Each structure stands twice: as C-alpha cells, then as structure tokens.
Design an enzyme around this catalytic site. Structure first.
Site, PDB file in Angstrom:
ATOM      1  N   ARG A 144     -22.520 -15.578  38.270  1.00  0.00           N
ATOM      2  CA  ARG A 144     -22.399 -14.146  38.084  1.00  0.00           C
ATOM      3  C   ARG A 144     -22.467 -13.385  39.408  1.00  0.00           C
ATOM      4  NH1 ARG A 144     -27.582 -10.877  37.870  1.00  0.00           N
ATOM      5  NH2 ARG A 144     -29.334 -12.358  37.687  1.00  0.00           N
ATOM      6  N   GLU A 146     -20.850  -2.937  22.476  1.00  0.00           N
ATOM      7  CA  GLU A 146     -20.023  -4.066  22.896  1.00  0.00           C
ATOM      8  C   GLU A 146     -18.722  -4.070  22.096  1.00  0.00           C
ATOM      9  OE1 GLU A 146     -23.202  -4.519  21.779  1.00  0.00           O
ATOM     10  OE2 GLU A 146     -24.283  -5.066  23.572  1.00  0.00           O
ATOM     11  N   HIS A 151     -31.105 -14.654  22.343  1.00  0.00           N
ATOM     12  CA  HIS A 151     -30.249 -14.339  23.492  1.00  0.00           C
ATOM     13  C   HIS A 151     -29.466 -15.537  23.982  1.00  0.00           C
ATOM     14  CE1 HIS A 151     -32.231 -10.517  23.533  1.00  0.00           C
ATOM     15  NE2 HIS A 151     -31.632 -10.167  24.666  1.00  0.00           N
ATOM     16  N   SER A 165     -27.216  -6.762  35.451  1.00  0.00           N
ATOM     17  CA  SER A 165     -27.212  -8.168  35.049  1.00  0.00           C
ATOM     18  C   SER A 165     -25.853  -8.846  34.927  1.00  0.00           C
ATOM     19  CB  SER A 165     -28.022  -8.328  33.777  1.00  0.00           C
ATOM     20  OG  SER A 165     -29.324  -7.793  33.976  1.00  0.00           O
ATOM     21  N   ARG A 193     -26.600 -16.881  34.419  1.00  0.00           N
ATOM     22  CA  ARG A 193     -27.619 -16.049  34.971  1.00  0.00           C
ATOM     23  C   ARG A 193     -28.248 -16.705  36.203  1.00  0.00           C
ATOM     24  NH1 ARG A 193     -33.754 -14.997  33.593  1.00  0.00           N
ATOM     25  NH2 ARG A 193     -33.857 -13.086  34.888  1.00  0.00           N
ATOM     26  N   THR A 202      -1.314   5.998   0.180  1.00  0.00           N
ATOM     27  CA  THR A 202      -1.684   6.818   1.315  1.00  0.00           C
ATOM     28  C   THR A 202      -0.428   7.338   2.012  1.00  0.00           C
ATOM     29  OG1 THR A 202      -3.594   5.325   1.523  1.00  0.00           O
ATOM     30  CG2 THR A 202      -3.213   6.881   3.366  1.00  0.00           C
ATOM     31  N   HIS A 209       0.822  -1.209   0.000  1.00  0.00           N
ATOM     32  CA  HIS A 209       0.000   0.000   0.000  1.00  0.00           C
ATOM     33  C   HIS A 209       0.863   1.269   0.000  1.00  0.00           C
ATOM     34  CE1 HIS A 209      -2.318  -3.341   1.740  1.00  0.00           C
ATOM     35  NE2 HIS A 209      -3.358  -2.779   1.147  1.00  0.00           N
ATOM     36  N   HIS A 259      -3.187  -0.448   6.880  1.00  0.00           N
ATOM     37  CA  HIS A 259      -2.681  -0.692   5.508  1.00  0.00           C
ATOM     38  C   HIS A 259      -1.566   0.249   5.129  1.00  0.00           C
ATOM     39  CE1 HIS A 259      -5.395   2.551   5.055  1.00  0.00           C
ATOM     40  NE2 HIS A 259      -5.973   2.263   3.931  1.00  0.00           N
ATOM     41  N   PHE A 265     -23.431 -11.726  22.942  1.00  0.00           N
ATOM     42  CA  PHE A 265     -22.949 -10.556  22.257  1.00  0.00           C
ATOM     43  C   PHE A 265     -21.459 -10.509  22.212  1.00  0.00           C
ATOM     44  CE2 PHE A 265     -27.044  -9.190  24.268  1.00  0.00           C
ATOM     45  CZ  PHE A 265     -27.801  -9.519  23.168  1.00  0.00           C
ATOM     46  N   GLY A 276     -12.331   4.160   5.472  1.00  0.00           N
ATOM     47  CA  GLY A 276     -12.719   2.866   6.033  1.00  0.00           C
ATOM     48  C   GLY A 276     -12.905   2.879   7.553  1.00  0.00           C
ATOM     49  N   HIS A 325      -3.990   2.952  -3.867  1.00  0.00           N
ATOM     50  CA  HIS A 325      -4.197   2.420  -2.530  1.00  0.00           C
ATOM     51  C   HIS A 325      -3.474   1.093  -2.229  1.00  0.00           C
ATOM     52  CE1 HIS A 325      -5.988   0.441   0.950  1.00  0.00           C
ATOM     53  NE2 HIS A 325      -6.211  -0.547   0.153  1.00  0.00           N
TER      54      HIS A 325
HETATM   55  C1  TPP Z   1     -26.838  -6.083  20.801  1.00  0.00           C
HETATM   56  C2  TPP Z   1     -27.540  -6.142  22.144  1.00  0.00           C
HETATM   57  N1  TPP Z   1     -26.895  -5.781  23.271  1.00  0.00           N
HETATM   58  C3  TPP Z   1     -27.485  -5.843  24.440  1.00  0.00           C
HETATM   59  C4  TPP Z   1     -28.817  -6.281  24.500  1.00  0.00           C
HETATM   60  C5  TPP Z   1     -29.482  -6.319  25.877  1.00  0.00           C
HETATM   61  N2  TPP Z   1     -30.405  -5.189  25.876  1.00  0.00           N
HETATM   62  C6  TPP Z   1     -31.704  -5.360  25.569  1.00  0.00           C
HETATM   63  S1  TPP Z   1     -32.462  -3.792  25.618  1.00  0.00           S
HETATM   64  C7  TPP Z   1     -31.042  -2.955  26.068  1.00  0.00           C
HETATM   65  C8  TPP Z   1     -31.000  -1.438  26.334  1.00  0.00           C
HETATM   66  C9  TPP Z   1     -32.372  -0.943  26.813  1.00  0.00           C
HETATM   67  O1  TPP Z   1     -32.510   0.373  26.575  1.00  0.00           O
HETATM   68  P1  TPP Z   1     -33.180   0.814  25.249  1.00  0.00           P
HETATM   69  O2  TPP Z   1     -32.819   0.051  24.042  1.00  0.00           O
HETATM   70  O3  TPP Z   1     -33.069   2.287  25.184  1.00  0.00           O
HETATM   71  O4  TPP Z   1     -34.690   0.290  25.429  1.00  0.00           O
HETATM   72  P2  TPP Z   1     -35.935   0.958  26.282  1.00  0.00           P
HETATM   73  O5  TPP Z   1     -35.826   0.641  27.725  1.00  0.00           O
HETATM   74  O6  TPP Z   1     -35.907   2.563  25.944  1.00  0.00           O
HETATM   75  O7  TPP Z   1     -37.302   0.522  25.531  1.00  0.00           O
HETATM   76  C10 TPP Z   1     -30.020  -3.913  26.140  1.00  0.00           C
HETATM   77  C11 TPP Z   1     -28.595  -3.517  26.552  1.00  0.00           C
HETATM   78  C12 TPP Z   1     -29.460  -6.632  23.305  1.00  0.00           C
HETATM   79  N3  TPP Z   1     -30.715  -7.066  23.279  1.00  0.00           N
HETATM   80  N4  TPP Z   1     -28.810  -6.554  22.147  1.00  0.00           N
HETATM   81  C1  TPP Z   2     -13.188  -4.201   8.636  1.00  0.00           C
HETATM   82  C2  TPP Z   2     -12.357  -4.224   7.418  1.00  0.00           C
HETATM   83  N1  TPP Z   2     -12.985  -4.337   6.257  1.00  0.00           N
HETATM   84  C3  TPP Z   2     -12.290  -4.374   5.130  1.00  0.00           C
HETATM   85  C4  TPP Z   2     -10.891  -4.314   5.154  1.00  0.00           C
HETATM   86  C5  TPP Z   2     -10.176  -4.355   3.780  1.00  0.00           C
HETATM   87  N2  TPP Z   2      -9.698  -2.984   3.494  1.00  0.00           N
HETATM   88  C6  TPP Z   2      -8.417  -2.646   3.780  1.00  0.00           C
HETATM   89  S1  TPP Z   2      -8.181  -0.961   3.378  1.00  0.00           S
HETATM   90  C7  TPP Z   2      -9.863  -0.743   2.849  1.00  0.00           C
HETATM   91  C8  TPP Z   2     -10.451   0.591   2.314  1.00  0.00           C
HETATM   92  C9  TPP Z   2      -9.373   1.586   1.910  1.00  0.00           C
HETATM   93  O1  TPP Z   2      -9.952   2.850   1.923  1.00  0.00           O
HETATM   94  P1  TPP Z   2      -9.548   3.981   2.910  1.00  0.00           P
HETATM   95  O2  TPP Z   2      -9.867   3.452   4.229  1.00  0.00           O
HETATM   96  O3  TPP Z   2     -10.051   5.268   2.384  1.00  0.00           O
HETATM   97  O4  TPP Z   2      -7.918   3.999   2.889  1.00  0.00           O
HETATM   98  P2  TPP Z   2      -7.053   4.654   1.781  1.00  0.00           P
HETATM   99  O5  TPP Z   2      -6.686   3.662   0.735  1.00  0.00           O
HETATM  100  O6  TPP Z   2      -7.635   6.026   1.307  1.00  0.00           O
HETATM  101  O7  TPP Z   2      -5.817   5.223   2.581  1.00  0.00           O
HETATM  102  C10 TPP Z   2     -10.496  -1.984   3.003  1.00  0.00           C
HETATM  103  C11 TPP Z   2     -11.957  -2.198   2.622  1.00  0.00           C
HETATM  104  C12 TPP Z   2     -10.273  -4.193   6.418  1.00  0.00           C
HETATM  105  N3  TPP Z   2      -8.975  -4.119   6.567  1.00  0.00           N
HETATM  106  N4  TPP Z   2     -11.020  -4.142   7.517  1.00  0.00           N
END
Ligand code: TPP
Ligand code: TPP
Ligand code: MG
Ligand code: MG
Lengths: 694, 694
Positions: A373, A436, A498, A400, A547, A43, A40, A80, A462, A173, A278
C-alpha cells in the site's frame, strides 16, 4: 381521487399532435410487452409525458451522434422501465426502429429487458439493479465538473461547450436502496448544480401499494441532505414539470430533486394504480381497452401515425443544428486553448504522454520492508504530476489506503475545506466518506461520463459493501479501479470482522474483474503501470494491497506482471530440458514464503520454481504457449500459497497438488502471530512441496 | 471553545461518579497504550453516556447476561469496543481488569471489535459500520413479535417481555446506506422500544467530517418518522437523562438522539482530531490526561477501590430487578400455561410432535413445478404448525413465494393496504427494496430470541446484502435467506439479473450453507432439515428457481440432509461394480444429469447420478460416506451447474469435466438461454465421454 392526479395541464405550444405522440408512447409500450408476453409496461405509460418532454424539448442532444461530447446525459435508474428510454430513442431518430421495439426481450435484440450500455446507441449506462443508475449519475455529475477543470476552467457559469446536465429518472425502489442515500448525501456535499433527478412517486412497487413498507417523507429527506427540492403533482402536468425543470436549471449550487406524484399505468382502466401494471403483460382486453380510450384501433398493433413520427423526428434536425452551433464555440475554444485541446485529444485517443512512466519508483531487493500500500501511494504520487486525468480518493481511509497523491488538493466546494484538506472545485482528491457502495457506483459514472481515470479506495473486506457496483462495472466492461488495502490477516489486530478470507476467491469469480495482487513494492509499480497503460484490455480492476510491510524481492519483472503470472526464479538447478522438481505458485504477501521455501528445498536437493501470480485473470488470458512455459503440464507437483481460501486454486494445482490457504475466520492479534498460527511459514510451504511429490 | 465539554451533573451525582467516569477515560487510554494500537478517543467522550446507560438507564442483571428480560444494548460503532468492555468490567458482567489488559491479543476476551459469544454480555458482533444499528432494528422487531407469541393481551409496559433496545452509533454508521434503509423501515413499523444515540462528533478517519458530510442528520430522521431530539455536549448527563425519559415516554415512534460531542476529551492535544479515533495517544498524552483528571501519571490500569465498589453495585441492583421480574414471569406462567410451554419448546430448540406430518409431496412425472413454488407450498404447510416461523420479502413476495398462505402481515394496522392487512403480531414481513437492511434485520431477529425468521430476494441481490450475510456466518447464527431466480433460468430480465458468479461467491463464505434443491421434493426436505437444525446452527441461503423443473425419481430426505447423495445407479451394475462415470449436479441441472444418464446407457456407459443440494453439508460428512457417494477410484467425473466452474474443480479433479457458464447472460426466454449456453443432456453426455477418454 384517481381523477385528480391524472388531469392534463398542457403548455401553450402543445398541439393535438403532442397528445397523439404521448398516446403513441403508451400503446407502443403496452404492445411491445404484449408481443413478448413479459416485461414492464406500466411505468412507461405514466412516464410518457415526462420522457417525451425530456427528449423532445428539455435536453440538448443530437440523435445522429450519440457520442456527441457536449450532449446532456440521461440515466434511467428505474431500469425496468426500459421502454421509456427505448421509445424516445425510436421516436426521436437515435437509431432504434419499430422492429427493435417489436423485438423487446428476445435473443440478441437491441432492446433487452434492462438497457445495456453499448448494446444500444443512446444508452449511457447499464441499469436494472435498483439504485445503481442514480448513484452513478452522481458520479457523472462530478466528472463533468472535473472535466471542466481540465478543459475550460476559466469559462463562465454556463458559457462553456463543456457545460451540460445529467437527468435521471428514479423510482420508489431507487429511493429505498441504501446506495441512493449515500450518493445523494454526497451529491449535496459537492453541490452538483447540473444534476437533476425526477423521482417517480407512484405509491406502487411489486408488492402493490408502497404503504406497506414506505412511509417516509422523501422530499424532506432530500431537503435534509441539502438538495434543491420541488414537488409536482400528476403525470400529465407537463406545465408543472416544465416549471420545475427551469427552476432546477436556475439553481446552480445544489443538485435538484423533483418528486413527481403519479398513477402507474395510466390510462389502463383496471390495471392502473396496481402492482400488476408494473411487471406483466396487461393482457389483450386491457390493451384493447387502452387503445379505445386514446382513440387507437384495438385490432392493430404497433401503430405509429405518420404525422406523429414526422413530428418527433424533428429532433434529428433540432439536434443537428444545436450540434452545429456548439461546434463554433468548441472550435473557438480550441483556438483559445491549444494546450488543453491537445490533452482532450490525447485522452479521447486513450494515449499517454511521452515519458509518463519515467519517474516510476524502484526499490532495491533487500532494502527496508515496505508495505504494498505504501508502494502504491509512492507510485501514485510519482504519476500524478504526469497524468492530469488521474484522480480519485478513499472511503474515509486516505491515511490507510495511501490514495492521496502527495501535494494534491481536494475535489469539492472551497466551503467544505478542512484543516487537513483544502477543497477547490477542480481539485484532485476525492472524499467519499464511509460510503463504499456509492463510491463504487460513482467510479462507473466517472469513466462512463468521459475519458478521465478515477480510482477509489477502501479495505478489501468492504468490497462486500460495494459488490453490486463492481459487478455492474465488469458486466459493462469499463475501466474502473478499486484500490483494496489490508488484504488479509496481515492486517492484524482489527480482527475477524475486518480480515478478508473469502474475498479474493469471491472477487476472482466475477467474470471480467481482474484481481491484481502485487508481490512487493515493485510489482505494485508495475501493476499501476499496466493498469494505466491498458495493456490487458478495458475491464475493471481491483488492486489488492497489504497493510503490513513485505520484503522487496529478487526477480520481479514488469513484463511478467503484465502477463499476470511469471517465473520469479527457477531453482539452480538447472539444465536444458530441466523441468523443476516442484512449482511453487504464490501471490501478494505469500510470495516471500515461496522464495524462503525454495531455499529450504534446495538445501534438501529439491529444485523448486517460484511463480509469482499477481493476476490470475491476465495469466489465464495469455496463450497456452506462454502458460505452459510458466506452468509446464508435465510437472504435476504444485503448491499454491495465498492468505485466502483454497477455492480458486484447485484447477491450477491439480489432483496431486497442495494449497496453503486459510479456510476459517481470523483473530484479533498482531500479524506475525497470525501468519504463524495459521501456518503461513516457509516450512509449511516446503512441507507441502514435499507431499506434492508423494 | 469549548462550552461543549462543560459538565451538567444531575442531583444524585457525587464525586464518586466523576471518578467512575474519569476512570473509564484513562482505562481506555492505557488499555490502548499497552497493546499499542486501538481506538481510545471515542471511549473517552462516550464515558458519561456509557456510564449512564449501564449504571442507571438499563434494566439488566450482570450475573445473568442471558436473562430473558434484559434491556439489550448494541454498540454499532464497533471500533469503540472499550466503551462496552469497560462497562462490562466496571459493572460485574464477567470481564476483569486482566481482560482490559489483554485488549487485542491472541485469544483474549477483548478483541478489537466486540464478538458475539466471545465475551459475556456482547449481544452481537459489530465492526463493519452500520451493521449494529441495522440489526438493532431487527432486534426491536423481534421483541414485538415475541410479545405477540408469549404475552399479547398484556398492557403497554406491563409485560415481563417488555424491554428496550439501546444503540450507540457514530458518524460512519450514519453515512452507511444500510443505516438509511433500516431507519426508514424502523419508522414504518413504529418501533417504540428502540432508542439510538448518535455520536455526532465531526470526526472520522479523515479528520473533520465537513469534507464529506454536510447533511442535517436530525432532520433526515424526522423525515423518516422518528422521534428525534438533539442534546449538546458529551458531559451533559442531565440533557442525556431527560432525552432518555422523553424517548421512553414516546411509544409509537423509534427515538433518535443526536449527541454532539468532542472526540477524545480531555486529551489536551489529541481531542477533536482523527488521531484520537484510531491510534495510541502516546506516553505524553496519556500522562497529560491522568494529570488533568487527578490520576497518577506513573501507574497504569489504576482503579480506586471506592470507584469499583460503587460501579459493582449493579450486580446487587441487577439481582433485585431480576427477582422482582421473576414474580411477574411466574404469575404470567400460571396465567398462560400454553404459551409458556411454547417459550420452553423454543428455548430448548425443540419442534412440536408431527410438525412435519403435512409436509408436501409430488409424484415423479407430475406437472413441472418451480422450486420456489415448492418452497411456498412447504412454507404454507408448516406455518400453521410453527408459530415461531415468520419472515417475508424485499418487495418480491409474489416472486419469492414467501407469504405463508392465509397469513397476516407484521406492522401497525395503519400501514395495511389492499393486498396486505397489517396487525402488530402479524407474520408476513415487508422489507421493501432494502436487501442489505433485510440481511441485518434477520440477524437481529435470531440474536434477540428463539424465533426463526427468513428473508427473500433474487439470488443476484445477495450482492446487496453481502456484508450482513458474512457477519451472520462469522457469528454462526441461524439466519435464512431465500434466494429465488437462481440462474439464467430466470429468462428475459437479462444479464443484470441473471446470477453467474453468485453460487461460487456465496459458497466461498466460510460457514454459509448454500442449499440448492434439485426439485420440489428436495425443496421440501431442505426446509425440513433447515428447521430441524440437523446440520448445526449457522446461516442458510436457500437457492430456488424461477422456472418449472421436473419432479424426479430417487429424491430422498436423508440424502438431502447429507448435502450430496446418490440419486440413481446406472442400470447395468453389479455389487462392487463402480460406475463408469459419475454425474454430479445441483438444482435445475440435475435433470440434465439424469437425461444424460439415459443417453449414456443407450451407449453401454454406466453413469451414477449424484444430486448435491449442499456441498458444505456433503463436505462435513465423514469420508466413509463421501467415498460411498464419490468413490476415489472413479476419476471420470462431470459436474453440472448453471454458474461458474470455480467451486467445482476440487471435486471433479484433473481429468474431470465441468459444464458451467463463464460469462454474463442475455435477455431471452429460459429454454433459448440453456440451449445457447450448452446446458442440455447431450452436452452433459458428451462431457462424460471426454472424461473417460482423459
Ligand atoms: C463498513 C465499514 N467501512 C469502513 C470501516 C472502517 N472504519 C472504522 S470506523 C470508520 C469511521 C470513523 O469515524 P466514525 O464512525 O465517525 O467514528 P468515531 O471516530 O466518531 O468514534 C471507518 C471508515 C468499517 N469499520 N466499516
Ligand atoms: C436492488 C434490487 N432489488 C430488487 C430488484 C427487483 N425489482 C425490480 S423493480 C422493483 C420495484 C418496483 O417498484 P418501483 O421501483 O416503484 O418501480 P415502478 O414499478 O413504480 O415503476 C424491484 C423490487 C432490483 N431490480 N434491484
Ligand atoms: Mg413505484
Ligand atoms: Mg464520529
């Protein structure tokens, strides 16, 4: 058009030499990629002026001590463009030589395609999976504030030997990746004044012009988060860059984001502003053409003028001197703070304070059923007081995950305090929100930055959201800790979205990730103990916790946990030279079935050994003598029990063994119904032991 | 406080509607109180909105939840499932009061989080936060592309194929990285028919969101390019309905509507707290709530007859809307016989005659060809013959071989670039560097209608999209993930890029078929099988190499479709002669299998070569077939795969050998890597020899 953006603006001190240094960067990159034939270059060429400015002028660091405590930290998130980092390391006297540049991307070289932590002096972190470096930088920033809390809290803004910056180079990216949104959103919440990120906005990625998939106003987005945002135009506008940097340093209540608009691969006459700059060698003609444009010899490669190197190598001396000045302040700090210095020294030597594990909780076999837990929270609450380096929190699930150390405050600006949580700057409890993936990245930042010990918590399910960070931690072999609760169908009514099924197998597959699954409240305690003590080396750990409540068992043993798998009870049984008839191997909430089935089998004149296996990776790392003592190869009758898929147990149980597993998705019902319906009962374990024999 | 919980009822709204709303709230409160766990809070505050969407806003027919022309709704905040359930019930969609009374019990129609196929009118499985919204995006995109295929020359809004996608998202959805990515790309593509409500309510599991969320979410949405509006108060139906019509009026920008709300209104003590989110209120709070709304505190699941009579009117309205729609459709059908024939072909899951007639072939011995190159060739060949097949890449089109040769790109013409011309009904997808969003979108596409979308990235980055992949397998819908650069074979990009644990980790996901063609022909047969739907209806991850691999002798369509088949029989054999040893390999490692077969014959050892492009398909075949390929009397077995050993132990048993890679790779060319890590014919042969001697 293309000419407006690539126009130079050099500051007052900038001589011909500096222009030659920059040009040297650009050709070294083109030649380095040309030699190996892949890489590369583009850049690295356009970012030369910025990288030059960062290493030579902006950053405080000492090229003769890449471990200098008080150094500014640099993270190339756009991994890269490794040559950007490699050439500064070389030019500035950090350890890399010309022959390393000439070994780009070859077996065993110090310059692999993406920079690797520990392979190369001066590389602060392995990067390459886009997003990771930026998201981790956020972690580093957070750690520097927490580390300040511990060593020099009463110092004044800027006046501490522990004050420094975290500089990040990110690309399109990096900017598109979800992890970056998360980490950025939270960076603002935490008001990380010492984080300064350049975003190389160059309208190019692998699919050429970014317009096909990127239309957002990234700068506005960052303003939305609450970042300090500036836009600078042109890769060669060193003046613009240096003003932006000083404006950023002056802002100490908001992390800073500088979008630098650029033309990729400048000055490649044909290849600049294209996807081809690139990720491939320019080809001999474009390389020759580039050398001509900058006044280099098109027939020689890896040409480095003596005056250029003499100039860039002045960083060695500047670094040394900065380091010597810093040393007086530190030494002054040590005399003024002998207590906190002793802590710094304990942490750097990776030692634990005498009797740190003396308050370690214990529960009596047979007492009230306790969730693994809840045991973990109790253990955390007990060790907190005795370990100031221990901090961490949860991805919106503190209730939790049991991750809040009882009576601890929260890490954040007081102005984010809530009814439930009081936030101080040097607080202990981390709140990542529903983020996460950024949580994972942050945790690597924390332990890469310094000697503190952070953990992050969420539901096992998760681990899927944060997988790329976990993987990267293991690759780096650094000691992050992921608390994963609600580890099975045991979790009950929340249902199949879950409930983990494949997760333990998939996590155990990741080379160097230790998956620790305590059988009960005491194994939990022995687990943490072994984790903090670093008994089994320095890799990442996933601590798997239930849990629902599980029995406290007879026969649990610290030493045995620390070994990964040990004998929980032989059957009585037994005589010298008395192998057991059958071995039951189980983990976490399924060890209680192994035991209960051991009772049902004795009542039928079958003599069963129960092996608890809280960490298969630790077990497998023990010498054969120990392993063959726990699982004698002459006993072929073996049964494994785990509320997860069978996949990772086959090698252990062999041809004639049985596995009590779950091979399909779960259901929305209470845990007792679930374990019953899916055949997680002593009887089923017993019945499998019986088939194990025929 | 509060002026937030103050009503603003439009001019048609009667007492009845207010009872209808109030009933939602108590129904939710009771429904959770019964089973004693769940998420009541949100379902209460969102009642007016949910009510307005189903009763009034949406065009759907509650007695044909499969109606082609229905508005689609996605509750991305899967935890407030009751909000969807109650409207399904109230509005005559199939759910009854007993289903509500069965919330979160074994096998009920109302699990904790809504489940596609389990309940009539749930469009998608949600629960992992972010997934529903990110997929909604995919749904929106599908509708546009489906319009392209059926009724392109129709006018904005005049098509029977014109409808909307409504999405309810919460704070957690808004925090999740996948949401960012999806949203960002939604704006690029200008999805006029996507309208999302965000329940901004300052509450999540850790109570008040201020502890981890300070961003101005609405600004952020403006930054993307989204039509944004803010409405204030859960009760402000007038605000909501104007917001709605403003959004429908705007047809060139996806619309976002931040509704500010108090969680769990009107629970006098539990509203505006984290406790309203995810536990049962308790008997007193429930009692209190009924009193406040004029409900009997001693009776549960009370539904006034006039309420239900009113809400059920939707059946009648839904019917007539469906009838009026039918005339237009039938008109459309007469006007477009050819496109109707396609709609009909697609709905019946049929393929046009001779669709696989141009299928590419390569002669064994011809020029080494990379399995990804083979895939693009195949894709190119089938594109012309299959209009429903679209898709693209996560900014890696060049490297994934996902662009159908001669195809155009999917997007507004104004995003066109030098390399890609975008038309509204274009075929090539550009996701940018957003793998997770890519995964969620593919699920949206195939959920929305009968088109067949695939997505492309490096195998390594299936890590980034894992929660979407897993959710596809849980739903058993036929998404396709093209994963290229499957191993160390990818070379110099190094250990951050080289997959090691991925095959195993992905195979672990129940119902994901991991298809790894051995060569260019297997590749072609793999596509053929995937599009034919020979092996059922779940997700496929198609594993392709970066580097060139031999075209081999003995490849066979029928055998690939079976997952694992005999590639060659050693030369020495007699009928009823088992082979001395069995070599089982996959993808790029099959050539080693063969080449070790030659070295073993030259030593009087007769070896079968089994190619195993899909272990999940092989495992699904009846034992007669499996034992024909892998006779249980031959214990001497060797597996070869450039990944970990984990998934191969059950197959090779106690006395078998696995030629695997158990650690991270290195930045060097592919031949050096396979040599250094022991992936040579000799090492395969040597392992065959040890197996025999075990
Ligand atoms: C990717 C992911 N991370 C964590 C959870 C656990 N989880 C369920 S709801 C929530 C957050 C609750 O707050 P919000 O989404 O604002 O819901 P509300 O109480 O406003 O309806 C989490 C961390 C999940 N379901 N999915
Ligand atoms: C999560 C992830 N997806 C895809 C790649 C493959 N990849 C490496 S560089 C790039 C994109 C290059 O574009 P940019 O980030 O603008 O870098 P540039 O070449 O301008 O410096 C990708 C898709 C990676 N390394 N990580
Ligand atoms: Mg770019
Ligand atoms: Mg909320």
């Amino acid at each position: 058009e293309i000419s407006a953006l690539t126009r130079p603006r050099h500051p007052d001190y900038w001589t011909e030499i500096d222009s030659a240094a920059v040009d040297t960067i650009r050709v070294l990159a083109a030649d380095a990629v040309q030699k190996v034939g892949n890489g590369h270059p583009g850049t690295a060429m356009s970012l030369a002026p910025l990288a030059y400015t960062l290493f030579q002028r902006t950053m405080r660091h000492d090229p003769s001590d890449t471990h200098w405590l008080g150094r500014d930290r640099f993270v190339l998130s756009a991994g890269h463009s490794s040559l950007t980092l490699y050439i500064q390391l070389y030019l500035g006297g950090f350890g890399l030589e010309l022959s390393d540049i000439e070994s780009l991307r070859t077996w065993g070289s110090k310059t692999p395609g993406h920079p690797e932590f520990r392979h190369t002096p001066g590389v602060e972190i392995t990067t390459g999976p886009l997003g990771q470096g930026l998201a981790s930088a956020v972690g580093m920033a957070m750690a520097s504030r927490y580390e300040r809390g511990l060593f020099d809290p009463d110092a004044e803004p800027g006046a501490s030997p522990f004050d420094h910056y975290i500089y990040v180079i990110a690309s399109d990216g990096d900017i598109e990746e979800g992890v970056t949104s998360e980490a950025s959103s939270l960076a603002a919440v935490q008001q990380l004044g010492n984080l300064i990120v350049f975003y190389d906005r160059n309208q190019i990625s692998i699919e050429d012009d970014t317009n096909i998939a990127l239309c957002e106003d990234t700068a506005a987005r960052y303003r939305a988060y609450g970042w300090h945002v500036q836009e600078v135009e042109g890769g060669e506008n060193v003046v613009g860059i240096e003003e932006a940097i000083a404006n950023a340093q002056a802002v100490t209540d908001r992390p800073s984001f500088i979008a630098l608009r650029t033309v990729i691969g400048y000055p490649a006459p044909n290849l600049m502003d294209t996807g081809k700059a690139h990720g491939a060698a320019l080809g001999d003609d474009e390389v020759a053409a580039v050398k001509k444009i900058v006044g280099f010899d098109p027939d020689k490669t890896f040409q480095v003028r003596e005056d250029v190197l003499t100039h860039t190598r002045g960083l060695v001396a500047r670094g040394k001197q900065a380091h010597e000045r810093w040393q007086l302040e530190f030494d002054a700090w040590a005399r003024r703070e002998p207590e906190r210095k002793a802590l710094l020294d304990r942490l750097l030597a990776q030692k634990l304070p005498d009797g740190w594990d003396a308050d370690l909780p214990h529960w009596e076999p047979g007492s009230k059923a306790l969730a693994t837990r809840a045991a973990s929270g109790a253990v955390l609450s007990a060790l907190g007081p005795k370990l100031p380096e221990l901090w961490g929190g949860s991805a919106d699930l503190a209730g939790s995950n049991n991750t809040t150390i009882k009576g601890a405050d929260s890490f954040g600006p007081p102005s984010i305090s809530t009814k439930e949580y009081t936030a101080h700057w040097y607080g202990r409890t981390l709140h990542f929100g529903v983020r996460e993936h950024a949580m994972g990245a942050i945790l690597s930042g924390i332990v890469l930055h310094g000697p503190t010990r952070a953990y992050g918590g969420t539901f096992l399910q998760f681990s899927d959201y944060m997988r790329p960070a976990v993987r990267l931690a293991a690759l780096m072999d650094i000691d992050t800790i992921y608390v994963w609760t609600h580890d099975s169908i045991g979790l009950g009514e929340d249902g199949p979205t879950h409930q983990p099924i494949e997760h333990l197998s998939a996590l155990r597959a990741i080379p160097r990730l230790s998956v620790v699954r305590p059988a009960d409240a005491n194994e939990t305690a022995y687990a943490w103990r072994t984790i903090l003590a670093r008994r089994n080396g320095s890799g990442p750990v996933g601590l798997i916790l239930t849990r629902q409540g599980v029995p406290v068992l007879d026969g649990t043993d610290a030493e045995g946990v620390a070994r990964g798998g040990y004998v929980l009870s032989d059957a009585g049984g037994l005589q010298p030279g008395e192998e057991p008839d059958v071995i039951l191997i189980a983990t976490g909430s399924e060890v209680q079935l192994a035991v209960a089935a051991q009772t049902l089998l004795a009542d039928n004149d079958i003599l069963a050994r129960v092996v608890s296996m809280p960490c298969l990776e630790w077990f497998e790392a023990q010498p054969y003598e120990y392993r063959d003592a726990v699982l004698p190869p002459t006993v072929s009758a073996r049964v494994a029990v785990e509320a997860g898929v069978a996949q990772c147990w086959h090698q252990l149980v062999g041809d004639t063994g049985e596995i009590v597993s779950i091979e399909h998705y779960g259901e929305s019902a209470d845990h007792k119904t679930l374990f019953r319906e899916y055949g997680f009962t002593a009887e089923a374990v017993a019945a499998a032991a019986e088939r194990a024999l025929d």
